[PDB]
Subunit: 354 residues, 4 copies
């Protein structure tokens, strides 16, 4: 037997109609009990299990999977989630860490990538799988992607030791701090542009063990509630004025991700470069990410953004850059020089160095 | 014979190394003369052609293609381009419109999608092909994509009547106001997520004629120099504070594209919704686009951004939304209500209406 | 209410383990009754429905879907299926045609593409959806693709009028005579290389109505049991000897699909060309298909296979070519010249005739 | 300076029209001289180079690339090529091995995958790049894929030590015994259903983790001893036992059976009797999937396994056939041993589980 905690935070997976729109819907465990793929009634009575705990049917090989449903309240559309919400999820995982072998987090799709990236950083030295999942269609609608996404998440967390925050959707397991949302309607809503999926499910389960991170059994779980809240993302657009950038980078902002053009370039007009230099003097740290979905930031042009307090984001997703920035800036008592060194390392498998 | 104007504005296609970095490089026509795929010397002498004009070798079918190279100065990395630069290109095309059968614009890749979208709107009633192209590797480096991208553009503009601003890269012709840049290194750098390519080149040339827009021969070319400059793009991110949005939307900003989450959703926290409402009262217009690459903005959630002065961008690329916003806000003497109605129409094939 | 017939012929979707291997498994309706996504017990009792008939829960819009399970016997691994088996399925659909609004056929994946193609031809003037589906993992294994494939098929047949033999797998509806199997393990096992999917399912259902064939209401359903059995497929490989081709094309073979190289080319060595000419003289008809997955057979090289009794397969899948060949050769009293003309037409949406300009 | 041999065997890359159809066209070096991307005239005169030898323009760093064009005769449409033709190419590479740092082979596309696979096996202990390339459109036609495919091949062979038979098309370098042709018209004609060994874009990315290691201690052994009596047989539904019997008659020594799905076939006894009968005669059978992607695996009662049947796992059919030809051509081995070799990864063509 392996035991999982299933943390239901909201999202379309469990929504219901009200006033002609989807809103978060309670009563998940009540529904899951009625579904044989999610709950084995025979086995429950045979072992007289606590009523709070569900049991998956037996799978082909391996151990049996039991899980407990923890329904947060209120439930949220993921568009409403913030660093504080992700911290609360991390703390749930921390409190219950020793009692469970893995975790699944039902989450809205709108910001799942940001959440996966955030939790990747908050959960330092993680030793157990934390699998985020969601759906484009609610589980109470007959024709949906929720059933198989939720089951897949539970089975992955239940059967494999992948000590990472991942995202499972549509038969694929992605490294969480490598995903981004590419489709607003299709079931294949997520993509991992600069890294292979960690796993694929088909006739057989294929796992890229060469990529999966190693359990650090000597080191304890350290949860970072100290995440800098004053970080932002700024997408450059052609002719963006210096005056607007000035306003954006005003105190109390401590860090910013600049999504630049192509291989990491921006306008070379002086008044704009002046504002970035000015913000560097105030102590602001800047990470340069590409607006492009695929590829890396690299030097090479006269228009490349580099210099005082600018760190290259290489091939990071913006969601990962923002989370890493929040993480590093939240660390206590470090020199700005040291903070920059950390931003330039691969801390959770989110960045590929050359 | 068909004659094209080749407008060289800059970009990696023609860059050179200097101080260990790529910068714009002059002298394109000088190089192209030396290349047999770009200039047929035999034919030039046989017709004693003007020295400014180049001739492509004969192609499989069709008419012969001649072209003239117009090298803008200064040349620019496309990261430095703005609405003003694209207006200048539109005006070049306007001045020379009657003398040429089509146009090719060599452009940097970093903002090509914005430029294509802008020109799409500026060139009202366009009757001739305007093909933007560029490269990930300069044409003076041996192993490059520039040669074939430039030749392809010239052949497409030279041989076909596609009255659209397009982008040609890597054997594909895209509708210009439908493209976006998806890869910063690969030769397949561009994608048209919510529309088929207009053409594909292989052994044969396949054109999606049932998508290509129809020539309106009665209507003259109207070039819009009146493009609103005070427009912006704002990407939402989780927990973006009201205070920051307030600062972003301060006068003199007239219009903004909000890149929202998923099917067009954002935080429902009241202080943020109050700033958008406040900006609507000041007269600002907002277009709601998805941060997602593929798919459409649609209502359906309690978190959907809709209401006063917010227009759904449906399946538009952000580059197209920004350009359309610039276009509509630059039109003279319209009510704010009318401006919104125009934003909700398909003006250049950039948006697909539901039905 | 719309009523469907669910024809369970076998395949991995319903297999069980025995001696460490998967074999066909009976008792489908018994399992489906226990599954709330497949059977609404409340509604069944509320309308006191016949015990043989299942009811899907209500869906977002549209009518309610009821269905009857017909479990063929014996059940088969699709690797064992032949023209005779597909004829039996066509005849089941014929007998029950008027009682039901659509059909779903649970079928093994190994030859689903051949079966879809065969049924496409056998069911002339079809007016109702016939949706084939299957799975890479059996429905009794917990982590599987069967649940969603079967539900999807039922919902597509139940809710839309697509008068075609289709294949539904992994959220996509393909034209059946356009599919081929491209992956032996992934759930995305099928691909339609020279045609778009007819439909895609996501948050919403998108249907390519511009491609879906039109119902011919005036014309009755004609089922062709007269399918020529003596047809074969022959894949060319470099240096394939004339002697081997000779042996392959011996009587009683009436038709063959030659899978050739690239744009439809083969060796020009004379002894080989002589065997094809010899077989043409015996009255054999040959269809030339490309080994390539995507693209078309076209003339252009000195190595292009063309001539006596050879018809270009253009962009047909080999599965479709073989079925069309079986269909056309089974038609009664036609000249060989006429048979060839029919092979060169688009009879069921399986072939795209080349564009002029 | 690095020197390459460019072996022009034929194919569309160099074809010309005649009687309204494409046929092989001679005079490649004559054309390439006139093209600045392919020949640097300044540099040629500056070093007074032999007239037979061409010089690519420089890149910034790295060495300069010179190459010699060897035009086979007659030139062939690849549809006409056989084991004998690929042996001849291997022997050209053997004779000139010491004089050149790499090789490029211009080849027709129709059977390039078979040829790449064959050469992969023939060229045991290969230490230098052998890059096959071709085109969907002839180089003399203005809008074509030939120019960039040929240049790419020369630059890859000239600049990198990838001791493998590869195929370069459309900005990608594939392991040769892993490719297959998926499109008959598009420039993206080939697919490796394994990662590409390299990709060319703004930068060149090479998957060094996959590229095989040079064995400098071991000499190049060229196998002319390739079994010719091997065949490929694609199963189709209801294929009769009588037809399979005829196909597997002597003198056939080996056959690749392209089976359904994960490696399955009809379980009807008369058919299984013919495969067993052929095994008794000494025939060896490799089971490959008709599917493009994935692996042959046991699991069903319909899986073809047993006497003298070896699983092809994830091999392409082109690789299975070539490996079968290779193994059967080896002298004095027991049939058991031949089967063990078929089940190993000999040239990177097969992934073991
Ligand atoms: N599909 C989803 O989950 C979208 C939903 N608005 C959410 O993020 O909560
Ligand atoms: N590939 C390119 O052209 C990049 C260049 N920085 C530009 O956009 O001008
Ligand atoms: N996935 C499957 O159904 C394969 C099985 N051998 C069959 O075709 O019956
Ligand atoms: N593209 C090509 O090269 C096709 C040609 N028929 C050949 O294989 O020789």
């Amino acid at each position: 037997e392996r035991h999982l905690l299933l943390i239901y935070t909201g999202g379309t997976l469990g929504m219901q109609s009200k006033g002609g729109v989807l809103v978060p819907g309670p009563g998940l465990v009540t529904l899951l009990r009625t579904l044989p793929m999610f709950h084995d009634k025979e086995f429950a009575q045979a072992q007289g299990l606590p009523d709070h705990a569900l049991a998956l049917p037996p799978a082909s090989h391996g151990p049996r999977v039991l899980y407990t449903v923890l329904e947060c309240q209120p439930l949220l559309d993921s568009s409403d989630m913030t660093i504080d919400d992700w911290i609360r999820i991390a703390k749930i995982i921390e409190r219950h860490y020793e009692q469970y072998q893995g975790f699944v987090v039902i989450h809205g799709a709108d910001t799942m990538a940001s959440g996966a990236s955030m939790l990747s950083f908050m959960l330092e030295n993680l030793h157990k799988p934390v699998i985020l999942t969601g759906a484009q269609v609610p589980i109470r609608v007959l024709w949906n992607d929720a059933r198989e996404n939720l089951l897949g998440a539970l089975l992955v967390a239940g059967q494999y030791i992948i000590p990472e925050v991942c995202l499972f959707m549509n038969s694929q397991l992605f490294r969480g701090n490598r995903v981004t949302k590419v489709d607003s309607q299709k079931f294949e809503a997520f993509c991992s542009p600069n890294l292979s999926p960690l796993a694929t499910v088909g006739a057989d389960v294929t796992i890229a063990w060469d990529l999966v991170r190693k359990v650090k059994w000597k080191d304890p779980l350290v949860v970072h509630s100290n995440m800098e809240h004053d970080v932002a993302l700024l997408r450059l657009y052609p002719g963006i004025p210096a005056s607007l950038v000035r306003a954006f980078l005003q105190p109390p902002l401590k860090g910013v991700v600049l999504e630049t053009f192509g291989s990491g370039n921006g306008p070379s007009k002086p008044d704009l470069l002046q504002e970035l230099r000015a913000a560097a003097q105030r102590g602001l740290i800047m990470v340069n990410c590409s607006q492009c979905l695929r590829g890396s930031v690299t030097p090479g042009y006269a228009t490349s953004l580099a210099g005082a307090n600018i760190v290259s984001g290489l091939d990071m997703t913006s969601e990962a850059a923002l989370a890493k920035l929040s993480y590093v800036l939240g660390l206590p008592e470090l020199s700005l020089e040291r903070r920059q060194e950390l931003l330039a390392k691969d801390l959770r498998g989110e960045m590929t160095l050359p």
